[PDB]
Every structure is written in C-alpha cells, then in structure tokens.
Amino acid sequence: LTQETVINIDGMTCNSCVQSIEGVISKKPGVKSIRVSLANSNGTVEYDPLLTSPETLRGAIEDMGFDATLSD
C-alpha cells in the first residue's frame, strides 16, 4: 500500500540535516521514496499505512531532533 504525507520540518540546519533526515527516514519501515526540501522546509514522504503513519514519521523526525508538524 502507498500513501503520501507532507510534514513541515523546521530547524533543518544546512544540507547536512536535510540529507541526514532524508537518508534515515528513507530506511524506516514503510517508507519508500522521500524528498526533503529545505526551500519549503518540509519532508514529502511516501509510506505504507500498514507499517508507519504521518504521526509516527513526525515522531521519528522529532526523535532525531527537528521541529516536525503535520502539514497535509
């Protein structure tokens, strides 16, 4: 199964943070493709509902240490 979610991520301090978030979250269960935009300050994540969810992904980003809030 495939669903998309946009999570606004504030505090992505330089491309280092962007890359780190993108790479780590990509490897979390359920996540398939992910595109983290610094310009829009958000993570556009494609994931499987059965494995993970928007709130879980927000939780993971928050655990890494970024101000994550569900956008759509």
Side-chain angles (χ1 to χ4, degrees), residues 1-13:
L1 187 61
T2 50
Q3 286 292 276
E4 290 183 89
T5 187
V6 185
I7 303 181
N8 290 343
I9 309 173
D10 176 68
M12 299 197 294
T13 306

Side-chain angles (χ1 to χ4, degrees), residues 2 7 9 11 14 16-18 20-22 24 26 28 30 37-38 40 43 52 56-57 59-60 63 66-67:
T2 50
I7 303 181
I9 309 173
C14 203
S16 54
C17 292
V18 179
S20 184
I21 295 160
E22 191 171 274
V24 171
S26 186
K28 295 285 180 179
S37 177
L38 184 58
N40 298 270
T52 192
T56 310
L57 295 165
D63 182 80
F66 304 94
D67 175 60

Side-chain angles (χ1 to χ4, degrees), residues 33-55:
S33 57
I34 175 170
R35 299 293 181 80
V36 186
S37 177
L38 184 58
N40 298 270
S41 308
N42 65 9
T44 300
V45 194
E46 200 301 293
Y47 69 95
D48 192 315
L50 305 176
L51 281 293
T52 192
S53 71
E55 60 180 270

